[PDB]
């Protein structure tokens, strides 16, 4: 319904270095995306909650941003347990969707 | 946060089979929870809103219901294509928490 584009959907990099994925939603979502991580067999993490918001117990090495339409999720300095998919969803309207993911992996 | 506990982790029925598969919350949750499907490499889709409400086209074999800390998602009909792996996520405070995960097989 609100679709959401994620970019990359396959990133590989090396421990240390600075990552960037993106969102895009079609309607302005106003701030209203949060972020999550799915590590390998587990349920999702939510990291980041409106846009903003770093969640209790998430490293400070992620952070997020975001007006409108864009937005974005750094991963400052990559370690290994980072090695997951990375999801963005909209809240402002029902249904809720879901970008359709980053794999991140290291090389 | 608050802690979720999905039941069953697995579970196997060939199709046509009622399966049932639960959600308790740690608290009162009072009514927020959702209820996710997510097949295998693709974004989680949100099936059930706030314990009861189908969301656009998702199909009238699911329901949900539920009020507290007990929760009851049930699949009436079996199919091929609902091999996934199901979530609840409570939302009435942060952490954003989810359930474990029932993995459904086809036997």
Do not use: H
Not at 67 to 95: H, M, R, V
């Amino acid at each position: 319904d609100i679709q959401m584009t994620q970019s990359p959907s396959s990133l590989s990099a090396s421990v240390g270095d600075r990552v960037t994925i993106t969102c895009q939603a079609s309607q302005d979502i106003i701030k209203y995306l949060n972020w999550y991580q799915q590590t390998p067999g587990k349920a999702p993490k939510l990291l980041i909650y409106e846009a903003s918001n770093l969640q209790a117990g998430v490293p400070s090495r992620f952070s997020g941003s975001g007006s409108g339409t864009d937005y974005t999720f750094t991963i400052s300095s990559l370690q290994p347990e980072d090695i997951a998919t990375y999801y963005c969803q909209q809240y402002q309207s029902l249904p809720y969707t879901f970008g359709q993911g980053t794999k991140l992996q290291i090389t």
